Amino acid sequence: MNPIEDDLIFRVGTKGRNKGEFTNLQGVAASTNGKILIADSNNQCVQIFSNDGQFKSRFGIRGRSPGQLQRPTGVAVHPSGDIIIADYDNKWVSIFSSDGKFKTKIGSGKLMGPKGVSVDRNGHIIVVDNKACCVFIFQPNGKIVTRFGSRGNGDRQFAGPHFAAVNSNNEIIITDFHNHSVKVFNQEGEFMLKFGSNGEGNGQFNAPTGVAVDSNGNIIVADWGNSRIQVFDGSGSFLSYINTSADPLYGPQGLALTSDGHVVVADSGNHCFKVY
Predict the structure, then answer these.
(1) Where would I find the NHL repeats?
(2) Which of 14, 44, 227, 233 sits most deeply, having the most CB atoms within 10 A of its CB?
């Protein structure tokens, strides 16, 4: 009965509704200026931490009106410092200043149930419409540049698309929760490739959620169903697991790459984020 060690660098958080506490961790983002952002769908807030896990700030007012949050899921940060939040229940995407002041909302009357949001290198806002099974690319002014996807199990289809990432070529990477796969599109939303299948083997998933691309171009994918994190190269060739065996994940949600090169994951069942 000997103790074991794994890849964990540090964890932050406990169950609750006060600052530093979480009920339902969803989206995770990281800023170029060294912050970690965590969306909580049930506390209706975003909390901002430093890279060493120090609490910095919180914002988010519960409600159903513009400027409020009801079920915030995805979070992204624009290089301006603006914070982008997708609301599954209000069915719009809010843009806030870095101090948490509401600026504008996009996608009003276009979205059914958004989860992931990402910003690409052209400053477009990528919105994953989980309920509609499609992905929107918006200008910050709210005009739709393109949309792609329909419900199903085809290569160009989704079944509960969840989160998004963008690589160095501005290609869009989408986790397809119920199709047990990761799908990659060009910046125009055209299908490039699919990887993963249902299972527990190397490169297999049971319900992918969080996704990020690292400084080496690797795709890092959280598996909600199997509670593990896998590393792939940019083509979807399996490289490794992150070793999470000593302090296991229970239902990992969002995942991001920190400015200091580390993987941060929302460990929803442990009411914390974990950095590897």
Answers:
(1) 9-52, 56-99, 100-141, 145-188, 192-235, 236-276
(2) 44
Resolution value (Å, 1 decimal)? 1.6
With tokens 């009003």, the residue in question is 108
CA distance 213 to 166: 7
Assign 3-state DSSP to the chain and report helix, strand, coil percentages, each to 5: 0, 50, 50
- Residue 6: φ, ψ to 5°: -145, -160
98: amino acid identity, one letter? S
Collapsing DSSP to helix, strand or coil, 55 comes out as strand
Residue 131 tokens read as 């309920």
Q: Which tokens go with 139?
A: 């200008």
Residue 130 to residue 113: CA distance in whole angstroms = 6
**Single-letter amino acid code for the residue at 240:** S
Instruction: Using CB atoms within 10 Å of the CB of residue 208, give its burial: 0 to 12 exposed, 13 to 18 middle, 19+ buried.
Output: buried
Residue 194 β-bridge partners:
183
